[PDB]
Write a protein that binds this DNA or RNA. Structure first.
Ligand SMILES: [Mg+2]
Ligand SMILES: [Mg+2]
Ligand SMILES: [Mg+2]
Ligand SMILES: [Mg+2]
Ligand SMILES: [Mg+2]
Ligand SMILES: [Mg+2]
Ligand SMILES: [Mg+2]
Ligand SMILES: [Mg+2]
Ligand SMILES: [Mg+2]
Ligand SMILES: [Mg+2]
Ligand SMILES: [Mg+2]
Ligand SMILES: [Mg+2]
Ligand SMILES: [Mg+2]
Ligand SMILES: [Mg+2]
Ligand SMILES: [Mg+2]
Ligand SMILES: [Mg+2]
Ligand SMILES: [Mg+2]
Ligand SMILES: [Mg+2]
Ligand SMILES: [Mg+2]
Ligand SMILES: [Mg+2]
Ligand SMILES: [Mg+2]
Lengths: 226, 134, 260
RNA sequence: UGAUUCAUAAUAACUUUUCGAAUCGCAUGGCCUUGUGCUGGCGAUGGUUCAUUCAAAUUUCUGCCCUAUCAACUUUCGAUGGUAGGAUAGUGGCCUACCAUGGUUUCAACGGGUAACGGGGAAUAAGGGUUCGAUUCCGGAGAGGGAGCCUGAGAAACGGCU
RNA sequence: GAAACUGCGAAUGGCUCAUUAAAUCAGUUAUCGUUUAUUUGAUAGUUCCUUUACUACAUGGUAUAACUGUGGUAAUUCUAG
């Protein structure tokens, strides 16, 4: 089968087609999230520790995490689960997923290197893939660059230069949750609106109570005369 | 000498859409169905606007001939005519180029084809190309 | 079935909108709003059909999205906003104000009022009740909750709402000898004074209304709207004053007015 | 209010504690300890409760074709009612538990047929009638047959799912 | 401004008359027997766990799509790491 191996701390990943099934009975009858040692997997993966994180069988059905059961069953999959993307709100689909137990009917395993071995793999460790996006929220930039509570995050924004041959410019994202005078003005407006709303309601209540007292005194005057 | 003698009945001034709207009665004896070019020119000269701020539509000519009755609009400016006037009738008057789209069937077929792709389809196209290469 | 309806068929529209039978299968279903669906007039029907200011519904939308129309002092850019009875429609361009009052045939009339009268409206009290924190409120016929009313205001009274600050300027009681605007039924649009109110505890209090030509008619109290004293109405009445001439006197008026 | 244990208020607490703006645009005024300090406009979108509107659900009275070669039907397994609970958005045998033995019928119940969706209406027009109404408007019901449910204010939805 | 997340709509319309004989439906009531998005109007100074133990309000947190990259299936508006 193929081994989709990913080394996430450089973000890099590649596939090794491993034939000669003496090497891949080390994977058999082991679930997802279980760790294996790479010496039995090969001489090139010597000292490495993989964690089985997923896989696809023949006929392409994915390994659902933590089913049991090295065969395929049809599950009623819901929202926020693997192996299903709902096309409506509240739509559940009876799809067939393949179990978490690794068997010989897999076409590809998914492995994550949780421990680098002795030798350096030619497509997993020597190469580093950069992250596509830097942080965008203010305090996420602050904890990315480790600054402080009070600092200008505007000066620490990761900018990327876009070159169209003749014209080169830079683009920076936005600072979501950025403390701005517009936000302070909006907060102040809401506080002032609550305060003057309560003041105007109390003034209307006091004026109405004066009216009620006047009508009560008039009614008492027009009743005591009788 | 041909006595086109256009007149405008039922005049309503509309500042809401910034125009004057009226019924165009065209008395054209010894003439059949004058044109809308002549009607727009001769309404432009009587309402003093411009040719391109005057809009005419209607003109069902009376049985037996010699009279055509329609509707007319004279906008306060050409920009206010292009803002408020339908695109088909701007295309009629030459104020707008006709948009060249696909037909209705190919537009809806393209939409239903694009409903089957989640995302931009760059990854899907790369996977399909690589897998169909082997 | 299965949910709220969103289409109004033409021929299922209210008859007083005077929509032509042909030219489309559908009628403008009014939005939810201050007035009931069959007792309101949408802005597309007012602008396109009554005032003739727009030829299409596309032009009604083009009028409203420039914030030209305003109903009761607020802009109301909806095409099918339910402008009903007593509603003041101000068009700031063209400098004119309309009050949506019925004509005597039972139809909303194009009635131009002044800018002084456009600064207020009248509202029939639907309920007087105590709200939360013990605060009295009054509900008018156009859905307005008005807090802290006069304690003498009861149901079937008429308040005068100021349309800028929506308060009660004054009010009119429901007594015998006060003007009525009939807002429902086959006597809709008629104006007269209350002779007396017939009680009927259990349901449907009746009102005996007499107009200026001494023609008495009986109307349910849901359809009675007080508009002022004997004479001197608080609103400006439309042309015709709610008299309901018969059809013989109507053709007599037409032959006496078209012959010059 | 025709009428209430209504509206509403108060007291003692209760709560896998509900809401009480960490949202967006445009304009950038005003004041004096000139700090990018304090204030500040027109809106948009949210949001609790009441009212309104659009509704929905249930419901009173009265009205339906032919058939007795259909005279008794209902009550096992809710049929009529009472009490209490559960359930519901809510009334209610809607369901459950315990009691009572009721309820409908020659003024046609119950059953059978319908080549029956009901109505506004249509044809024929002395008057009365007779016949039609799947069909452009209103209401119902259904998405091949049944059943079950998700999401949602609203569906037992089928150009939603099992 | 594609994509995608979120929001709203998808419950309307349209079709058909199979079921259905106090059932639907019609006129008439009732909700003092209820739910109600939206619209419209009104509405919220009280937020402290057992105050003499508060943790930013010039404003808290992570976790995901789109995207990148590696794939499986002959195939689906399949989707996995
Ligand atoms: Mg933001
Ligand atoms: Mg429907
Ligand atoms: Mg509408
Ligand atoms: Mg109980
Ligand atoms: Mg009970
Ligand atoms: Mg029982
Ligand atoms: Mg049938
Ligand atoms: Mg005969
Ligand atoms: Mg029928
Ligand atoms: Mg029918
Ligand atoms: Mg049939
Ligand atoms: Mg129908
Ligand atoms: Mg259905
Ligand atoms: Mg079929
Ligand atoms: Mg079916
Ligand atoms: Mg929805
Ligand atoms: Mg279904
Ligand atoms: Mg279909
Ligand atoms: Mg459908
Ligand atoms: Mg969404
Ligand atoms: Mg909406």
């Amino acid at each position: 089968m193929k081994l989709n191996i990913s080394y996430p701390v450089n973000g890099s990943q590649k596939t090794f087609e491993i034939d000669d099934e003496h090497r891949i009975r080390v994977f058999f009858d082991k679930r997802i999230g279980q760790e294996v040692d790479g010496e039995a997997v090969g001489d090139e993966f010597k000292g490495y520790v993989f964690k089985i994180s997923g896989g696809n069988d023949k006929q392409g059905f994915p390994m659902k995490q933590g089913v049991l059961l090295p065969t395929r069953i049809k599950l009623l999959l819901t929202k926020n689960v693997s192996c299903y993307r709902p096309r409506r709100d509240g739509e559940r689909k009876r799809k067939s997923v393949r179990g978490a137990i690794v068997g010989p009917d897999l076409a590809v395993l998914a492995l994550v290197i949780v421990k680098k071995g002795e030798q350096e793999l030619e497509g997993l460790t020597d190469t580093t893939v950069p992250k596509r996006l830097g942080p965008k929220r203010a305090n996420n930039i602050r904890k990315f660059f480790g600054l402080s509570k009070e600092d200008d995050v505007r000066d620490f924004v990761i900018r990327r230069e876009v070159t169209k041959g003749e014209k080169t410019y830079t683009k920076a994202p936005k600072i979501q949750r950025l403390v701005t005078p517009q936000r302070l003005q909006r907060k102040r407006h809401q506080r002032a609106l609550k305060v003057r709303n309560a003041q105007a309601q109390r003034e209307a209540a006091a004026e109405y109570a004066q009216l009620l007292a006047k009508r009560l005194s008039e009614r008492k005057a027009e009743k005591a005369e009788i | 000498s041909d006595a086109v003698t256009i007149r405008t009945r039922k005049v309503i001034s509309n500042p809401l859409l910034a125009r004057k709207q009226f019924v165009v009665d065209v008395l054209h004896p010894n003439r059949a169905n004058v044109s809308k070019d002549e009607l727009r020119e001769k309404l432009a000269e009587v309402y003093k606007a411009e040719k391109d701020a005057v809009s005419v539509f209607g003109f069902r000519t009376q049985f037996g001939g010699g009279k055509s009755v329609g509707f007319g609009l004279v906008y306060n400016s050409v920009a206010e005519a292009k803002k408020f006037e339908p695109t088909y009738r701007l295309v009629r008057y030459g104020l707008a180029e006709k948009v060249e789209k696909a037909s209705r069937q190919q537009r809806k077929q393209k939409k239903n084809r694009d409903k089957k792709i989640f995302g931009t389809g760059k990854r899907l196209a790369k996977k399909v190309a690589r897998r169909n290469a082997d | 079935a299965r949910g709220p309806k969103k289409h109004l068929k033409r021929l299922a529209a209210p008859h007083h909108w005077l929509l032509d039978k042909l030219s489309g299968c559908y009628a403008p279903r009014p939005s939810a709003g201050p007035h009931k669906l069959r007792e309101s007039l949408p802005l597309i029907v007012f602008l396109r059909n009554r005032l003739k200011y727009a030829l299409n519904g596309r032009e009604v939308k083009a009028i409203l999205m420039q914030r030209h129309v305003k109903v009761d002092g607020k802009v109301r850019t909806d095409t099918t906003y339910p402008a009903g009875f007593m509603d003041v429609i101000t068009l700031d361009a063209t400098n004119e104000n309309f009050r949506l009052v019925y004509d005597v045939k039972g139809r909303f009339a194009v009635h131009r009022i002044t800018d002084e009268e456009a600064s207020y409206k009248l509202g029939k009290v639907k309920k007087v009740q105590l709200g939360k924190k013990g605060v009295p409120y009054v509900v008018t016929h156009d859905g307005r909750t008005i807090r802290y009313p006069d304690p003498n205001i009861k149901v079937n009274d008429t308040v005068k709402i100021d349309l800028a600050s929506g308060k009660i300027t004054d009010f009119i009681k429901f007594d015998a000898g006060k003007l009525v605007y009939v807002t429902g039924g086959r006597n809709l649009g008629r104006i007269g004074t209350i002779v007396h109110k017939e009680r009927h505890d259990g349901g449907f209090d009746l009102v005996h209304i007499k107009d200026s030509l001494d023609n008495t008619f009986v109307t349910r109290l849901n359809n009675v709207f007080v508009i002022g004293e004997q004479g001197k109405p608080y609103i400006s009445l439309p042309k015709g004053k709610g008299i309901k001439l018969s059809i013989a006197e109507e053709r007599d008026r037409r032959r006496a007015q078209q012959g010059l």
